[PDB]
């Protein structure tokens, strides 16, 4: 029996985790087992207790990708030496060069472009955090120091909740997974936790056994349905109709929480029947334009709705049509938003809503009634943001939550998007360490914004002061809406101005709306970068893979962008499909091979330590060090070339020779370990870690619950404090404290009375079918994040690829396939008016008829390297160019039109 006992041996064990952005980030603590100087295997530590005795713990955490990551570290997907292109881009001809040569070529290309046209020539395109918080910090810090252009990561990927943004004025709200244990009714929608949250899926099945009713709203009977009591089989993109049907039920049957609606929302605010706009004090007595009104039926009069608190001292009217005399002496009819909604929901009776979304009447009525009487928590996943009209779908869900009083309470919530990213953003901008006063300027600037805000409006909240700050700082550091440069520089105007692929309720194209928006000053030159008359010349790939990530990027990048680019360089651990087109690939240290910390959110609300268990192989470098070296070389090469200064985008001069000293804080930050210690200090300084929770304690324990959302948007958006003894849930301040919302109406706002919305037919939540993006083809293609990989991190891993068919697959309904003469395992062409791809077919009864599904794959896993994404176009929702309204705005990760609307794109399928 000693031959198996032989295997159960090792030399040492360290803490590890994975920096790939699973979401909610699992932040799973592993034992990393090293032997013979190599990572042999890993296993979950399972040391994450419950919040208290009544709740389920988080143990063991983990997933199959994490639990087999040792295979990544020794896999043939790794790049271990700097490579320089030998053939054409993408030809697969490489030679090894030194870091010196590779960093030198990169630096020269940076210099060349800065000399030719200033800093607009450099693009760090939407890096994600997969390489690590410190790598993200490095890339951002670099771009900021150089005043380069960094398209917004979140808008670029399509992880946003614009309907939340537009209803509540914020989206950075979340709950922790154990919050489901306090819900009586749980809706998993536009999401697939079986695939996408395996570390905490258990809270869903365990809530079920505790008595929670679990509902999966999905077009397909999706992989999460084994935990579900009910599948709500929506037609792709039709969720609004479902949720409006539910709202109609609660209103018609008088099941709604009248008090909550009257307090929390715009439903009782009065709207003018002549203009369609909220009745304002300006209209009535020449007061404030944003002072709005309730009707007091007892008093027989319009009464000002407070801008400063949601607390009510009487019950506003909901039902009715009334009159108001304006300052003109003219009398008009006014009615509450609610009264308009009652009319509007006549088109969403269960019978009618059922016709629109394909959900049976019985289920619409059952769930209408249940939502009104049950503490209800949802998880809206990021397929919502990837739907053209996800905002409408989300607004409609929030209307049902409003009507049922389902927010601001234990066991409520909609997603997990509250998090502290202080460790990354302070690392990214500070000129000196935290312990040396590095946060002082930022912290005094933050106060400035608060003072200015209160001055503008003394009813303003901290949350509002923080948003104004965010709007400014985002543009000061070169973070820009990604639609702009894609439109102006990557030829996407030719796709996005196609009226055939636009919502037909819109009166004009995306670009026409853009022109109107810039004419009105809603987008400035600090948003539209690189400027249209600049040419992108240097393009940095870091935790980003545009060949699959950009919708239609597989065509638009090679055909339009790459030809303009003098240098494409990648900081990679792995030979991604996009790295195959690079001029220079720089090898990086991977998980367990560099000190790091995970980047958790509310869902799994603990930071986890990642040790350097083993040295990186070959000439793999930490990304901070790699970037530091590039910047030193920029300085050195500039000096050798007799150059001193370059112009930033505002035409101010910056010295090449100070880039490296600034980046490293004059030698203080050279390694991940250096940066980790600084991130720990940052977390201590902002309350995310206890003040006495040092790096020494962190290294020893391996993980710790965070104690706050830090100092960024989440701290205010989340609108609750973190109490580690109970599940995290948002919006408590709004409900308990009657705190106003940062919106036009100061309330959770279902009526958007902005001209564009009024004209588009979207002033109220409403159902619009997905635009016919791709042309008139009969399937609606949907996707999802892969079960089998965290993004592409494991898509080129032999070991993990043996858990599946090892290649791209399209899931089709069995009968649909049969009707096209296609069998399981056949190849098929997917195509539309724009492009095509070939993919292996999986047939399943669980796919909705005329739906097909591709969970994403890396582009070089496909024939001709044409991924399904090639046909996805990414039509941005033009209404998201809107400004001139409080909650219509852009700051980092929030707002602007996301080019991400791939869910429901039209494709045809034929056998190949």
């Amino acid at each position: 029996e000693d031959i198996y006992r032989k295997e159960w041996k090792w030399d040492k064990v360290n803490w590890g985790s994975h920096l790939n952005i699973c979401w909610p980030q699992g932040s799973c603590k592993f034992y990393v087992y090293v032997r013979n100087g190599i990572v042999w295997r890993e296993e979950q530590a399972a040391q994450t207790p419950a919040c208290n005795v009544d709740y389920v713990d988080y143990n063991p955490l983990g997933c199959q990708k994490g639990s087999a990551f040792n295979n990544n570290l020794y896999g043939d997907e790794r790049v271990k030496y700097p490579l320089k292109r030998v053939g054409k881009r993408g030809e697969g001809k490489w030679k090894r060069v030194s870091w010196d040569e590779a960093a030198g070529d990169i630096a020269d290309s940076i210099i060349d472009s800065f000399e030719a046209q200033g800093s607009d020539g450099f693009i760090l395109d939407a890096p994600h955090v997969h390489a690590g918080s410190i790598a993200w910090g490095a890339g951002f810090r670099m771009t900021y120091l150089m005043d380069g252009v960094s398209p917004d990561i979140n808008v670029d990927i399509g992880d946003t909740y614009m309907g939340a943004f537009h209803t509540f004025g914020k989206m950075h709200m979340g709950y922790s997974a154990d919050n489901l244990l306090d819900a009586e009714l749980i809706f998993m929608t536009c999401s697939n936790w079986s695939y996408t949250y395996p570390s905490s899926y258990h809270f869903l099945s365990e809530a079920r056994y505790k008595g929670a009713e679990v509902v999966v709203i999905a077009p397909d009977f999706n992989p999460t349905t084994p935990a579900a009591d009910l599948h709500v089989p929506v037609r792709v993109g039709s969720d609004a109709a479902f949720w409006l049907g539910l709202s109609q039920v609660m209103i018609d049957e008088k099941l709604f929480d009248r008090q909550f609606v009257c307090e929390q929302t715009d439903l009782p605010l009065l709207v003018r029947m002549d203009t369609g706009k909220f009745l304002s004090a300006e209209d009535v007595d020449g007061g404030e334009a944003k002072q709005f009104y309730f009707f007091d039926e007892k008093a027989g009069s319009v009464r000002k709705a407070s801008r400063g608190t949601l607390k009510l001292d009487f019950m506003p009217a909901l039902e009715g049509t009334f009159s108001a005399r304006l300052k003109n002496g003219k009398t008009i009819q006014v009615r509450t938003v609610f009264e308009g909604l009652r009319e509007h929901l006549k088109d969403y009776t269960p019978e009618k809503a059922s016709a629109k979304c394909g959900v049976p009447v019985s289920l619409i009525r059952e769930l209408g009634r249940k939502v009104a009487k049950k503490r209800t928590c949802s998880y809206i996943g990021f397929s919502s943001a990837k739907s053209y009209h996800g905002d409408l779908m989300e607004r409609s869900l929030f209307l049902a939550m409003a009507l049922s009083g389902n927010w601001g309470k234990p066991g409520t919530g909609a997603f997990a998007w509250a998090y502290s990213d202080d460790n990354m953003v302070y690392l990214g901008v500070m000129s000196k360490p935290t312990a040396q006063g590095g946060m002082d300027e930022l912290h005094q600037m933050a106060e400035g914004f608060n003072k200015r805000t209160l001055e503008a409006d003394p009813t303003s909240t901290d949350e509002m002061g923080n948003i104004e700050f965010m709007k400014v700082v985002t543009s000061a550091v070169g973070l820009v809406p990604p639609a702009m440069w894609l439109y102006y520089h990557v030829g996407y105007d030719q796709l996005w101005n196609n009226k055939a692929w636009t919502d037909p309720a819109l009166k004009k194209s995306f670009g026409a709306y853009l022109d109107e928006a810039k004419e009105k000053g809603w987008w400035t030159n600090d948003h539209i970068r690189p400027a249209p008359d600049k040419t992108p010349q240097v393009y940095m790939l870091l935790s980003q893979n545009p060949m699959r990530r950009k919708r239609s990027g597989a065509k638009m990048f090679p055909d339009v962008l790459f030809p303009k680019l003098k240098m494409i360089f990648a900081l990679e651990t792995r030979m991604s499909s996009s790295a195959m087109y690079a001029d220079i690939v720089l090898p990086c240290a991977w998980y367990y091979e560099k000190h790091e910390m995970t980047t958790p959110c509310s869902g799994n609300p603990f930071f986890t330590f990642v040790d350097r268990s083993v040295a990186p192989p070959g000439e793999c470098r930490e990304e901070w060090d790699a970037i530091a070296l590039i910047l030193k070389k920029v300085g050195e090469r500039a000096a050798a070339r007799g150059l001193t200064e370059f112009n930033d985008h505002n035409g101010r001069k910056r010295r090449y020779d100070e880039l490296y000293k600034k980046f490293t804080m004059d030698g203080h930050l050279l390694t991940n370990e250096d940066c980790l210690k600084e991130m720990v200090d940052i977390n201590r300084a902002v309350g995310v870690f206890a003040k006495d929770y040092t790096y020494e304690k962190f290294k020893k324990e391996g993980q710790t619950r965070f104690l706050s959302m830090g100092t960024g948007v989440s701290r205010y958006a989340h609108a609750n404090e973190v109490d580690v003894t109970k599940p995290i849930y948002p919006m408590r301040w709004h409900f308990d404290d009657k705190k106003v919302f940062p919106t036009h109406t100061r309330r959770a706002q279902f009526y958007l009375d902005h001209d564009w919305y009024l004209e588009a037919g979207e002033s109220l939540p409403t159902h619009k079918d997905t635009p016919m993006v791709g042309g008139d083809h009969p399937f609606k293609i949907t996707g999802g994040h892969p079960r089998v990989s965290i993004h592409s991190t494991h898509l080129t891993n032999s070991h993990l690829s043996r858990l599946h068919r090892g290649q791209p697959v399209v899931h089709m309904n069995s009968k649909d396939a049969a009707e096209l003469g296609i069998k399981d395992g056949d190849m098929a062409k997917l195509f539309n008016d724009f492009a095509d791809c070939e993919i292996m077919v999986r047939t399943a009864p669980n796919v909705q008829p005329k739906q097909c599904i591709v969970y994403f794959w890396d582009a070089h896993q496909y024939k001709g390297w044409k991924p399904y994404d090639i046909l996805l176009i990414g039509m941005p929702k033009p209404l998201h160019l809107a400004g001139g309204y409080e909650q219509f705005r852009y700051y980092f990760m929030n707002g602007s039109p996301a080019p991400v609307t791939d869910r429901g794109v039209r494709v045809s399928i034929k056998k190949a």
């Binding site: 713990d57 030979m575 009864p845 669980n846």
Partner: protein, 337 residues
């Protein structure tokens, strides 16, 4: 004499394959074991693992031994080879792509481990499927043991673990044909057969077996069937909600499954019903005639919870403290052999 048992709660299983990799990354990365998924997880309805194992005979009928047939490498999930060098470095551009090649045929695979993932059964709008984790059952009446003419297979009297003595094994593979679960696997390098060892190197140090311990879905319980304080005893023997897989194969298997409740289906009228869509006879095919009772108990107990009455059963199946699932096998996985 005692018997180690595992309970697997199919309601909780999310098909993540962590258990698959947990096993593989200790035991089955050695030459000749790469195809072996001693812990395997596939979608049900499906062909299972190995492919069509339910058609391959073995076991006992009326206590009569049944002939069986040997799985192939492909049946056993293959060991896909990939072409990294070809795609990245060979100057072939987009004329080649990253893809698997069968280790058996040297060509593109038309099957492999978990090939029928997420497919399942039923008919729209009532499709159904769940995930089915399996390992060696460490049977009370093991057919594998009975089959080996060299007597290389034995069942530990202390804990009921069934093992193939790797020194005496000659690779005759009668055991493979005889095991109606096809839970013994030929190693063509050693030319012996191998199988789940119930992680005995770990369990003899009080460390839970890896496929149980590493399951993020908290699906798995483990322990001695006679230990009246254990989850496994309470679910198999007391509540009797954890049922054997294919007990009609005559081997007395010692893994037990909590059958899936499943999602409510739609009726012929297209309206929502109050009944699961999973056909009872399908679940009965796998877990026997007690399925109906079990589903009824699960629903009743779940209602007891919901109503504020409490339920030991729901407490057990939820297990708010994870380590309580493991029957006293609670040592951290930090003691070596």
């Amino acid at each position: 004499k005692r018997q180690l048992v595992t309970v697997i709660d199919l309601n909780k299983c999310l098909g993540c394959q962590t258990c698959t990799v947990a096993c593989k990354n200790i035991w089955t990365k050695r030459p000749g074991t790469e195809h072996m998924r001693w812990n395997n997880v596939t979608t049900y309805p499906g062909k299972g693992y190995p492919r069509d194992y339910e058609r391959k005979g073995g076991g006992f009928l009326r206590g009569e031994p049944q002939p069986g047939v040997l799985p192939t490498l492909i049946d056993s999930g293959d060991d896909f080879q990939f072409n990294h060098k070809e795609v990245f470095y060979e100057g072939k551009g987009q004329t080649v792509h990253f893809h698997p090649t069968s280790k058996s045929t040297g060509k593109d695979p038309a099957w492999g481990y978990n090939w029928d993932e997420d497919q399942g059964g039923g008919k729209w709008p009532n499709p159904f499927f769940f995930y089915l984790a399996r390992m060696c059952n460490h049977c009370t009446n093991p057919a594998c043991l009975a089959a080996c003419p060299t007597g290389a297979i034995y069942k530990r009297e202390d804990n009921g673990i069934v093992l193939v003595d790797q020194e005496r094994c000659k690779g005759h593979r009668h055991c493979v044909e005889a095991c109606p679960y096809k839970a013994i696997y030929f190693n063509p390098v050693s030319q012996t057969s191998e199988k789940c060892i119930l992680c005995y190197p770990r369990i003899e140090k009080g460390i839970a077996n890896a496929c149980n311990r590493q399951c993020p879905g908290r699906v798995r319980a483990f322990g001695y069937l006679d230990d009246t304080t254990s989850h496994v005893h309470k679910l198999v023997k007391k509540w009797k909600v954890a049922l054997p897989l294919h007990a009609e194969y005559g081997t007395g298997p010692n893994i037990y499954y909590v059958p899936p409740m499943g999602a409510r289906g739609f009726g012929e009228d297209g309206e929502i019903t109050d009944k699961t869509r999973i056909p009872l006879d399908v679940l009965e095919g796998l877990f026997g005639p007690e399925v109906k009772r079990v589903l009824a108990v699960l629903h009743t107990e779940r209602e007891n919870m919901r109503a504020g009455r409490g339920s030991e059963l729901m407490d057990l199946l939820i297990s708010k403290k994870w380590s309580d699932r493991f029957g006293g096998f609670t040592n951290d996985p930090l003691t070596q052999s």
